[PDB]
Structure 1
Amino acid sequence: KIVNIGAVLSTRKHEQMFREAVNQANKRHWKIQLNATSVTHKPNAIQMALSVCEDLISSQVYAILVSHPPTPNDHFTPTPVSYTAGFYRIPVLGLTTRMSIYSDKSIHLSFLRTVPPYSHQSSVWFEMMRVYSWNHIILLVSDDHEGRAAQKRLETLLEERESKAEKVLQFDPGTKNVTALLMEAKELEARVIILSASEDDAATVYRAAAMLNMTGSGYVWLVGEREISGNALRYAPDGILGLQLINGKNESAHISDAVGVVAQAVHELLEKENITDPPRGCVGNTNIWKTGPLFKRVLMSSKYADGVTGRVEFNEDGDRKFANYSIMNLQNRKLVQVGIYNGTHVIPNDRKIIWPGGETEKPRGYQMSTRLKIVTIHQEPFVYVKPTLSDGTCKEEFTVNGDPVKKVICTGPNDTSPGSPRHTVPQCCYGFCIDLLIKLARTMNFTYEVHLVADGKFGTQERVNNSNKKEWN
């Protein structure tokens, strides 16, 4: 009967929240079954387990629940207690965290959350697609487990509905001269950019680009919530679309809903058969439960309708499905609530989007340049290549009937042999494709910027060294 529940907190009024929530669980939804245990955060990561083994595991705790910290942004990430649970595969609901390195059930066995990681924010941008009609994406990613998982859920949700991204760029955190990558940037057709990074990185980024003049009208910024924080709030342009997970920081409502989930979890465990008894000592135990995955399956398959937040159902990965989302805008450096989401249902607020460059009309990232890079291959008669004058200009000559031949400037190498230095030279050009593209000019309004082949060959797939990696030439 005696069921012990553990916790890690900051202020002891929330310990009182736990005790009176235990009494609520005694009340809401039939002998004697509950007792409460909690030990707060330590300043150290040194011992940790001594409180865990000697206090909570010694008291046969089924679940320890941990918020962030009293630093709210630190590297004080609640790692070690989860691993002490992982000695015996002990269920813990990550109350407040969003560091998705905890997300893998391989390394982090049974640590299921009421707060989604930043990963599902990725899917939010897909939601943005369906109202704001894009095709072409710019992605800027921190080299994390987190950023790569963001990439992967992006790619999967791209290739479930066959939308196809153009480029992905990578970032080491803390690097400062970024400028070539953002130029890189300014080369492309799309003007919709998504950032996934830390704060300082981003400021680093937000401020840096503003210089690179990418924040004016015709630009874009799809932004995660850590990038909507403090210093990131100070040096970004206004008008950036932002997000908040609704009810983000009052711990106590999530605490209460968590304890209620735990309570009916305990009762639905008591519904089953061959129920095993909880261990006390760490000294003398390496033995796993019989019922570890049974804890997991009861927490997975459970339903909780009338929480403070509403419905709490979990993923296959075991974190909340269909939670409420909000879109914000700093306009004149004040956040304005714009967007409302049950899980997928879209509501804009009637206060209108000042798009953060020019006018409040919705742009298109489909703008061309009409400067098209063409490459020609040395094949007569389809291509003739001849050198220029001493002017560097092209001669004026005739056809058979004497028409003036349309001739094209082409840059390329002189010494087109393998293993030789290659030297950029403008040279005069004849052939079909010139006349074809000039017909395409007078029909299609482009400019035409023509190169030779760097190799002087067509190009096929070969394997480079280690003999498995295919590349087109």
Structure 2
Amino acid sequence: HEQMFREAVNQANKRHKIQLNATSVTHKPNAIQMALSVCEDLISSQVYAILVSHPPTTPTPVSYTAGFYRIPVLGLTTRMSIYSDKSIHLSFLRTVPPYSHQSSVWFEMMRVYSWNHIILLVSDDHEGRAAQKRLETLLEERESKAEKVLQFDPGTKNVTALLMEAKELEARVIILSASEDDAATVYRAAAMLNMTGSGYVWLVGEREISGNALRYAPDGILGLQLINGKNESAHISDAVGVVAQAVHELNITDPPRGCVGNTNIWKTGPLFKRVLMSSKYADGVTGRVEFNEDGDRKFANYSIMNLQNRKLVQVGIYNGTHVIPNDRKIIWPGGETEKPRGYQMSTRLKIVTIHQEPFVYVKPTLSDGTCKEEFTVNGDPVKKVICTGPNDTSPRHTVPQCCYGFCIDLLIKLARTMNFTYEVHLVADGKFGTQERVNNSNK
């Protein structure tokens, strides 16, 4: 409100060019009046930067209006990834890390617990896509693959199809990132599908944990929350201190003070943004603040919360380069004191065989479905496996035949000595395999 803004501005002036101060803004239900209010404020105040901390439930109108005239502004509440890119919002800056940082910490946590597997359950929104891209890039830099990256559908019900696909996969670990409504819907389906427990580990972001915990969060999740998220909602003191330092650092011209009629942009606006990036506000209030990349600062610690005892608890904090887990033992969904294995063995291998006369014979089955059993040259049962493959190249659709020979005999020996459970399956089109070029893509 006004009182907090006056206190923050007064403190900034006392901290220590001409009558430097900031004027608070009042949010409106419709952005149309919001844009008009900010336009009047900029014309009158003509302040170098504007601070937006509206807890709507909107930072778009302020950033969009700041784009014109190239007047950089600082946002302190929104964490959506759409503001990370400066191409669309070239006048938007913030200190809180973006949601892509959640992917960075997830990879660090995954590497900490000797996990190399994941089932990335990501929403289809822009924020979800950015998180997947950031996680994929980090995994690629480490020569690691995400296995399944099956997408999602915002504001959709009956999503059991995706859950069924994930369940059949070997790896049992899911890093979920979506909205509160999506998180609740997925959690309900997972609970009804026996997916929350046994050897399953859940990793979710701040929004997912809060929303899921409200409605249907099982007591086996592992959520992440900002160390000073609530304080970040009222840490404008750091913002005013950094802005004052940036202006004190720096051939400049006063920003335009005319909103009713103007086309010229601020010449020094880009320079002010450049100096702001170089600014290193190492005061230490609410942790060290250092802008990273463009539009965000990657210098905020991240805490880990768990739903043990039906309540959120702290099981460690992130130092900025490595996690520091020192709290009580983590209560996994199954209740075991040891971290459940993130990978599950799959002893149901499917084998592809190609018809070669000396090695893998192919013979049709009898009427009953099982082909006749013969004897070897010296006298002995011949091991035959019921294989499925094309008839001609005629049903031409998975006619069940029976295979036998060198390779099949070798396969049976391998299965016995290591516990397989094989289901032979002939190649769809008879061809050993080669690299063909299609649409300028050889691989």
- Show the counterpart of 2:120: 139
Q: Distance in 2 between matches of 1:60 and 1:44?
A: 23
Q: Distance in 1 between matches of 2:103 and 2:36?
A: 39
How far has the Cα of 1:334 moved from its partner?
0.8
Q: TM-score, normalised by structure 1?
A: 0.88
Which 4+ stretches in 1 moved above 6 angstroms? 465-468
Greater relative contact order structure (CA < 8 Å, 6+ sep): 2
Q: Distance in 2 between matches of 1:219 and 1:227?
A: 17
User: CA offsets per residue over residues 188-215 of structure 1, 9 Å max, x none?
Assistant: 1110101111111111100001112111
DSSP 3-state at the match of 2:120:
strand
How far has the Cα of 1:321 moved from its partner?
1.9
Instruction: Give yes or no for contact 1:222–1:240 (8 Å, CA) kept in 2.
Output: yes
Of 136-145 and 43-52, more deviation after overlay is shown by: 43-52
Q: Distance in 2 between matches of 1:141 and 1:37?
A: 40
Q: Distance in 2 between matches of 1:160 and 1:264?
A: 36
Q: Distance in 2 between matches of 1:358 and 1:340?
A: 22
Instruction: Give yes or no for contact 2:118–2:146 (8 Å, CA) kept in 1.
Output: yes
Instruction: Give yes or no for contact 1:58–1:279 (8 Å, CA) kept in 2.
Output: no
How far has the Cα of 1:343 moved from its partner?
0.9
How far has the Cα of 1:394 moved from its partner?
3.0
Instruction: Give yes or no for contact 2:225–2:302 (8 Å, CA) kept in 1.
Output: yes
Structure 1 residues 213 and 197: alpha-carbon distance in aligned structure 2, compared to 1, 3 A threshold: same
User: CA offsets per residue over residues 298-325 of structure 1, 9 Å max, x none?
Assistant: 1101111224212100111242223111
Instruction: Give yes or no for contact 1:138–1:192 (8 Å, CA) kept in 2.
Output: yes
Q: Which structure has more helix as a fraction of its residues?
A: 2
User: CA offsets per residue over residues 400-449 of structure 1, 9 Å max, x none?
Assistant: 22232111111123232xxx753333211112111111221232221211
Q: Distance in 2 between matches of 1:101 and 1:161?
A: 26
Q: Distance in 2 between matches of 1:347 and 1:362?
A: 16
Q: Distance in 1 between matches of 2:414 and 2:81?
A: 51
Structure 1 residues 153 and 231: alpha-carbon distance in aligned structure 2, compared to 1, 3 A threshold: closer
Of 15-24 and 183-192, more deviation after overlay is shown by: 15-24
How far has the Cα of 1:222 moved from its partner?
0.4
DSSP 3-state at the match of 1:374:
strand
How far has the Cα of 1:232 moved from its partner?
4.4
Of 360-369 and 83-92, more deviation after overlay is shown by: 360-369
How far has the Cα of 1:42 moved from its partner?
0.9
How far has the Cα of 1:461 moved from its partner?
4.5
Structure 1 residues 246 and 369: alpha-carbon distance in aligned structure 2, compared to 1, 3 A threshold: same
DSSP 3-state at the match of 1:265:
helix
Q: Distance in 2 between matches of 1:252 and 1:197?
A: 22
DSSP 3-state at the match of 1:129:
helix
Q: Distance in 1 between matches of 2:22 and 2:431?
A: 76
Structure 1 residues 252 and 370: alpha-carbon distance in aligned structure 2, compared to 1, 3 A threshold: closer
Structure 1 residues 369 and 172: alpha-carbon distance in aligned structure 2, compared to 1, 3 A threshold: same
Instruction: Give yes or no for contact 2:183–2:212 (8 Å, CA) kept in 1.
Output: no
How far has the Cα of 1:390 moved from its partner?
2.3
Structure 1 residues 408 and 185: alpha-carbon distance in aligned structure 2, compared to 1, 3 A threshold: same
Aligned CA-pair RMSD = 2.2
How far has the Cα of 1:464 moved from its partner?
5.8
User: CA offsets per residue over residues 139-163 of structure 1, 9 Å max, x none?
Assistant: 0111122111111111111122222
DSSP 3-state at the match of 1:62:
coil
Of 407-416 and 31-40, more deviation after overlay is shown by: 31-40
Structure 1 residues 363 and 230: alpha-carbon distance in aligned structure 2, compared to 1, 3 A threshold: closer
DSSP 3-state at the match of 1:174:
coil
DSSP 3-state at the match of 1:168:
coil
How far has the Cα of 1:392 moved from its partner?
1.5
Structure 1 residues 165 and 70: alpha-carbon distance in aligned structure 2, compared to 1, 3 A threshold: closer
How far has the Cα of 1:228 moved from its partner?
1.5
How far has the Cα of 1:81 moved from its partner?
1.8
Q: Distance in 2 between matches of 1:434 and 1:163?
A: 33
DSSP 3-state at the match of 1:428:
strand
Unaligned runs of 5+ in 2: none
Structure 1 residues 232 and 466: alpha-carbon distance in aligned structure 2, compared to 1, 3 A threshold: farther
Instruction: Give yes or no for contact 1:253–1:308 (8 Å, CA) kept in 2.
Output: no
Q: Which structure has more strand as a fraction of its residues?
A: 1
Structure 1 residues 243 and 425: alpha-carbon distance in aligned structure 2, compared to 1, 3 A threshold: same
Structure 1 residues 236 and 23: alpha-carbon distance in aligned structure 2, compared to 1, 3 A threshold: closer
The answer to whether 1:462 aligns with 2:436 is: yes
How far has the Cα of 1:459 moved from its partner?
4.0
Instruction: Give yes or no for contact 1:304–1:313 (8 Å, CA) kept in 2.
Output: yes
Instruction: Give yes or no for contact 1:67–1:251 (8 Å, CA) kept in 2.
Output: no
User: CA offsets per residue over residues 337-381 of structure 1, 9 Å max, x none?
Assistant: 112112123221331111112422112233212111001112212
Of 169-178 and 17-26, more deviation after overlay is shown by: 17-26
How far has the Cα of 1:264 moved from its partner?
1.0
